Amino acid sequence: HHHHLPNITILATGGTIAGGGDSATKSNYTVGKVGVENLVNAVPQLKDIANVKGEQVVNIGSQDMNDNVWLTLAKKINTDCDKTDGFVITHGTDTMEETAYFLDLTVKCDKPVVMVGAMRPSTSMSADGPFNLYNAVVTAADKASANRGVLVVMNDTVLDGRDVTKTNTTDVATFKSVNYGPLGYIHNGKIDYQRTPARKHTSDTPFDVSKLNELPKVGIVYNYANASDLPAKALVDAGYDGIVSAGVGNGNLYKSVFDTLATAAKTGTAVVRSSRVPTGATTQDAEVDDAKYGFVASGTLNPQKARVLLQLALTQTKDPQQIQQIFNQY
Amino acid sequence: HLPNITILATGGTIAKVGVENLVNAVPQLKDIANVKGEQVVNIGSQDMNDNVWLTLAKKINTDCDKTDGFVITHGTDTMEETAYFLDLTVKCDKPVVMVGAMRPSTSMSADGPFNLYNAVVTAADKASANRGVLVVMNDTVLDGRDVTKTNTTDVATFKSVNYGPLGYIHNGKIDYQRTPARKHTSDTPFDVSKLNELPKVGIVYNYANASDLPAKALVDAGYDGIVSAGVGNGNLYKSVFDTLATAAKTGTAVVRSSRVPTGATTQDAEVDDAKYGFVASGTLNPQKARVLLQLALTQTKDPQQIQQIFNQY
Amino acid sequence: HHHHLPNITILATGGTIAGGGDSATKSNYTVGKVGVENLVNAVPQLKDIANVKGEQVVNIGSQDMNDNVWLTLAKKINTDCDKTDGFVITHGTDTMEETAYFLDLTVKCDKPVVMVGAMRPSTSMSADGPFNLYNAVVTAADKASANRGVLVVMNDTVLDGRDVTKTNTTDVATFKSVNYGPLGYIHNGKIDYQRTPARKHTSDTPFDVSKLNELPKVGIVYNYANASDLPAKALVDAGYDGIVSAGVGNGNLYKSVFDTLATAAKTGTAVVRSSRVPTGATTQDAEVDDAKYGFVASGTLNPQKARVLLQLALTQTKDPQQIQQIFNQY
Amino acid sequence: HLPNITILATGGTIAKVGVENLVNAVPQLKDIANVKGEQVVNIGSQDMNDNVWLTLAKKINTDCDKTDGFVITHGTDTMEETAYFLDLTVKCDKPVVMVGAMRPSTSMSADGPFNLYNAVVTAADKASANRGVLVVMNDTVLDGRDVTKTNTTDVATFKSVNYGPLGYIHNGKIDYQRTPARKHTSDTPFDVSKLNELPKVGIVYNYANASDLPAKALVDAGYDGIVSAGVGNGNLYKSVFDTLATAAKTGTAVVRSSRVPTGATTQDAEVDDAKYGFVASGTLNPQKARVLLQLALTQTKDPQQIQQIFNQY
Ligand SMILES: N[C@@H](CC(=O)O)C(=O)O
Ligand SMILES: N[C@@H](CC(=O)O)C(=O)O
Ligand SMILES: N[C@@H](CC(=O)O)C(=O)O
Ligand SMILES: N[C@@H](CC(=O)O)C(=O)O
């Protein structure tokens, strides 16, 4: 009997993991500049763990991530599923938590899909991307990684696509699942999994994007003292399918913003109350009578995460009670 | 002799209820201070606004020598904004301490009473002076610049997430170990004594496939400033970046902040702030950056002078 | 059809939840002074949620918690299981994380067992114990609480008995599951569970304490710069069954301490390497060759938690590989 | 002109490897300083000890005017202890910065290089002066009193868990926003210049059913001090409490600390410290409390004077 390594596919999309600057010590750099091959070759030990094949999907900063790249990824994973044992997606850190949740809801492939990035560019002293990529390959290769939904692997930690968020602007340790914690820790190329997400993911969702050319239009508005209603009115004037509110506290809205969203909701715009507060649920049965206005409470989904779910909810239904039920199940 | 402490009530879950009722509900306040209450407004802090800010700064500044310290009762939702506004505009050199409650007055294990007691402890402490406007919540004294609401329901929600608290309160005493270095109160140029309105500053949000429609609506209204809640280290979605690049050369100040809950939006990363005429917010989150941008716009419209204000206060 | 409330039993053991002082505003108090009845009557709304029956088991500060009270609790729960729908145990906060883990390993009753305490005494302004107790009753009454092991409920949060630990000396928010996060959050008397512990608990362990009169002797030694070997030698001289090391960093030992524990291990004393560091695993395959010395790595179990498991391991076996396997499964 | 910076190497994962190799591996150090390296010892910091502490304090104090600042390379396991010892005993008014690495030198994405660079940045910054002994790890400047190792393997492990960091390091610059209030360095009475050994102080651990055998072994050896790693707010298991109550009246100083990772061990809770002659450690964790108790025992054996040292440093 001979040892055979898993086949792992790296789908590259850009990010600081592929960024470069002209000094190892200066902070200035440009994103999404280095190709997949360079990234693979910067981690010689990948041969110890897997047979790795790189595909460049796009090469962008994830600040410019968009619906089309999401659709491209989910269809590619779902199409290529039987050709490989696992997927790693190199990606910018800025919107990784959004892509990860989109994929967590739309991937039907039953093989691990692991996202990874780097907070320091590839050119920098003590660059994090090499060891991150190695650890993402470890996770994508591990049989025990299956059936946990789509994953993010950063700073020696396996995180679920739903709860994972970027907590700090610069720290290599930025990614945390701030409400429910990580799924497992990685040491010496091995994972001790102690948790799995309970919310329904991947092949247990009704979201099927195989045939979609676009996603429903959903925007985000912020609340704060003396908040203008102009952002909200602009989305309503443009025929937006949905609006997510980054509320204050427990999903609360500045009155002007409330009035514009209450009206929009009456016309059939889906409105989700979320919170600019970085941890904790936007609950039902607090200061906003959601049933009355036809609003939906986002639970622990932050505004960018709630947008993902809301867009996907809007592909199945425009009924707010059914959208609320979706927000309670996925 | 006990210190004279004034409670300025503004609403919030800590009260709907009047200043007099909240005082009498904590009779042990009489052990530590002579408290007088005045009702400024009575609103949920989700409806906090510039007019209330101006009223508060003006009242503290004018009433400063009639009392030994102030406590401001406030909703928790925007307490972090009001605290930083007052941090930059209070000229009174006596402690100003904001407090709220995450549970209702009538709920099991309501936090308001002890929160109020400890806010008065803090306002009455001579060591609390010259530390800027403060927030006291969950036995902790927090500086008004860094303090933010971190959880939607936790009594322990308020934290100074970048630089930590100033001291902790135990048995009615504070062991202070820190003070903020950024200039505050009477060390700032902001003087709101004769202003009846503040520059219009709005906040836009970045995310994948972000619409430029919000940013355009602010530009079309002739907003004096726009704060971006960027992705990561203050980054902008291309459509948003395009609109703001235009606003910055067309009479609208642009501050890059971040939707990310901790850490600075830095210069010298991916964005050439000098080329576009943008200002990096540092550790000021979007709502905090709005406060400081509104006040900077009372002094100057020049990006470089705004960037220096953002580096000093 | 008529609504019937669950039957919940409160087993009282003491703690600050039952403490009292002479002022609502001064910090001084005495622990484990108030009886169960007073605690129940301080939460009038308990009638809305359950039929509550209180039993005083002991009335102590949990700084004086001990093996006999553990045995008393586990046997009482296992004996009384069919007489009630759920258990709440009021307890001091200081060693709640140890009792909770002991019960998580020894309770065979398939009904919820929820521990609760209070960081402020019952007499204090804004005392936390009333709402904590209410929330613990909510959790013990919830059908969805079953099969999650033994729980701690504090500060509106449901925490698993294994990972839960006291993080701060005074804060009402002190209890956190610092490695893997909480199981669910409580809002308006309802729980949204998103996680369950993967490590084996309750009726899936081999630990059966029904017949035990005592537990094996296991002590804890601390490491630091210039650490004395005298604590370790004292436990070895007394015939201790086990010793847990609160190591520095990744379970490392000051050399004098290492030498004494290496020798003890050769004579059949079980030695577990844990860490004084508050989060993260004490791993295998780092700076200590555990196989060589016959030592056991504690994983994420902190020293007091590792003591619990080690004592229970020693009731089944004295073989270090088998003890290591236990530390990898429970 | 670049500042002269001295690296004093002591071992740790950041190196086994010599001071000269570690320097040459980060050639960009030449952009910011003139670095000279000296090997003090070469050990895993799990074997750190009093002799090394004394060597380091003595060397810095004596070499202070020959250089512009010091960086000390050290294992991470007990860096938090060494930093606080030096915090209390360094009399040199130039920056002293400790640094280590959580990953080996030869591992993927080793943290040591950038950690070292940023430690030199910090040591070279004029603004770093008069802030006490520092720890620089993961782009963060941490005070030596509060800093502790919070995770067994994370590169981001070091945090000042009670009062937060002093500043963050970006693009070779520090934006300092805090400084420690507790007295340090040249504001302390501790003078180690002529000492060749330190008072014997041991640490005992509390947990359910705790043995008194460790505490008794220290008492029987005539230890000068015992620090208790208490449960909760510095509480003691009855057997341990009994033994320590005896030690405190029999020539052994007793400090109550806590195994709990954050927050103070307070007076005025469950334990009558005055009655027993005990000292409460405040936010000093057991290993930190040992450092300060050893140094207090060089000045006094009196519990009340020890309690005042614990309240000031
Ligand atoms: N702007 C970069 C940041 C990073 O990857 O760290 C991106 O998200 O593509
Ligand atoms: N909505 C309330 C929340 C609170 O005070 O806890 C307010 O901010 O006024
Ligand atoms: N010493 C008390 C502390 C508390 O309950 O909060 C106990 O553990 O019993
Ligand atoms: N055992 C090593 C750990 C490290 O340096 O990361 C030391 O402290 O010397």
Domain boundaries, chain D: 1-199, 200-313
Classify residue A239 as exposed, middle or buried by CB count within 10 Å of its CB (0-12, 13-18, 19+).
exposed
- Comparing CB atoms, the residue among C182, C188, C199 nearest residue A194 is C199
Q: Which of D46, D82, D135 to mutate to test the pocket of ligand 4 (most atoms within 8 A of CB)?
A: D46
**CB of C94 sitting under 6 A from ligand 3:** yes
Classify residue D106 as exposed, middle or buried by CB count within 10 Å of its CB (0-12, 13-18, 19+).
exposed
A213, two tokens: 């050319």
The CATH number, out of the four listed (3.40.640.10, 3.40.50.1170, 3.40.50.720, 3.40.50.12280), of the domain defined by the range C1-216: 3.40.50.1170
Q: What CA–CA distances, in Å, run from D169 to A19, A40, B179, B263, D125?
A: 20, 30, 20, 11, 11
Which atom, in ligand 4's list, is nearest to the CA of D101?
A: 6
CB D132 within 8 A of CB D143: yes
CB A254 within 8 A of CB A224: yes
DSSP H helices, chain B, are 19-24, 50-63, 79-89, 112-124, 213-220, 238-248, 273-276, 286-297, 303-312
HSE, CB side, 13 Å, CA atoms: give it for residue B117: 26
B1-199 against B200-313: fold identical: yes
d(CA C10, CA C98): 19
Taking every pair of C-alpha atoms in chain B, what is the biggest distance, in angstroms? Answer: 63
C-alpha A261: how far from chain center:
26
d(CA D67, CA D2): 12
**CB of B258 sitting under 6 A from ligand 1:** no
Q: Count how many residues are written for chain C.
A: 330
Give the type of residue at B52.
V
Kindly report the number of other CB atoms within 10 A of residue C91's CB atom. Answer: 30
CB C131 within 8 A of CB C124: no
Q: Which of C252, C253, C276, C288 to mutate to test the pocket of ligand 4 (most atoms within 8 A of CB)?
A: C252
Kindly report the number of other CB atoms within 10 A of residue A101's CB atom. Answer: 30
Q: What CA–CA distances, in Å, run from D176 to B178, C42, D162?
A: 12, 49, 18
d(CA A321, CA A323): 5
- Whether C322 has a binding-site annotation, put simply, is no
**CB of C275 sitting under 6 A from ligand 4:** no
Kindly report the number of other CB atoms within 10 A of residue D280's CB atom. Answer: 24
CB D38 within 8 A of CB D71: no
DSSP-derived 3-state class of residue C313 = helix
CB A149 within 8 A of CB A104: yes
D257, two tokens: 């600390």
- Comparing CB atoms, the residue among A180, A182, A281 nearest residue C187 is A281
Ranges assigned E (strand) in C102-257: 113-116, 151-154, 157-160, 164-166, 175-177, 184-187, 190-193, 218-222, 242-247
Identify the CATH number of the domain defined by range B1-199.
3.40.50.1170
DSSP-derived 3-state class of residue D310 = helix
Local structure of residue C32 (DSSP, 8 states): S
DSSP-derived 3-state class of residue A25 = coil
CB C181 within 8 A of CB A195: yes
Tell whether A44 is within 8 A of chain D (Cβ). no
Q: Identify which ligand lies nearest to the alpha carbon of C252.
A: 4
d(CA A35, CA A22): 17
Q: What CA–CA distances, in Å, run from A44 to A4, A34, A88, A138, D100?
A: 18, 17, 17, 14, 26
Whose Cα sits closest to atom 7 in ligand 2?
B75
CB D257 within 8 A of CB D204: no
Resolution in A: 1.7
CB B109 within 8 A of CB B157: no
Q: Estimate the crossing angle of helix B303-312 against helix B286-297, to 10 degrees.
A: 120
B13 is catalytic: yes
Identify the CATH number of the domain defined by range D200-313.
3.40.50.40
HSE, CB side, 13 Å, CA atoms: give it for residue C302: 27
d(CA A53, CA A72): 18
Of the candidates C243, C240, C311, the one whose C-alpha atom is nearest the C-alpha of residue C271 is C243
CB D164 within 8 A of CB D141: no
Of the candidates A21, A27, A92, A99, the one whose C-alpha atom is nearest the C-alpha of residue A61 is A92
C-alpha C108: how far from chain center:
16
CB C130 within 8 A of CB B109: yes
Phi, psi (5° rounding) for residue A250?
-85, 65
HEC sequence for B96-115: EEEECCCCCCCCCCCCHHHH
Kindly report the number of other CB atoms within 10 A of residue C188's CB atom. Answer: 9
Interface of D with B in 152-171 (CB under 8 A): 160, 162-165, 168, 170-171
- Comparing CB atoms, the residue among C185, C193, C199 nearest residue A281 is C185
Domain C217-330 has CATH 3.40.50.40: yes
Of the candidates C265, C276, C237, the one whose C-alpha atom is nearest the C-alpha of residue D213 is C237
Tell whether A131 is within 8 A of chain C (Cβ). no
DSSP string, B221-287: TT-SEEEEEEBTTTB--HHHHHHHHHHHTTT-EEEEEESSSBS-B-SSSS--HHHHTEEE-BT--HH
Interface of B with A in 277-306 (CB under 8 A): 286-287, 290
d(CA D286, CA A293): 56
Strand (E) or helix (H) holding D37: strand D34-43
